[PDB]
Amino acid sequence: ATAASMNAVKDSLQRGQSTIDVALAAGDTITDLLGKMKEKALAASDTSLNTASF
């Protein structure tokens, strides 16, 4: 019985792996968007821009 009970342990570990995989995909999206936001802040920091570009 103790040996057969390991199936639930393996299933729970696999489910945790899937949860972390989804989290990493979302994190990659968030990092790309954060890089774009950095570039927008850098571009807007310039004082020679007109009102429309800002």
Partner 1 sequence: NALKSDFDSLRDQIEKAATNAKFNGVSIADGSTTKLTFLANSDGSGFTVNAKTI
Footprint on this chain of partner 1 (rule: CB under 8 A): 38, 42, 45-51
Rank residues 25 and 33 by Cβ distance to partner 1 and give the closer one: 33
Rank residues 3 and 52 by Cβ distance to partner 1 and give the closer one: 52
Q: What is the DSSP string of 1-54?
A: -TTTTHHHHHHHHHHHHHHHHHHHHHHHHHHHHHHHHHHHHHHHT-TT--TTT-
User: What kind and span of H or E run contains 48?
Assistant: none
The least distance separating partner 1 from the CB of residue 40, rounded to whole angstroms, comes to 13
Rank residues 17 and 45 by Cβ distance to partner 1 and give the closer one: 45
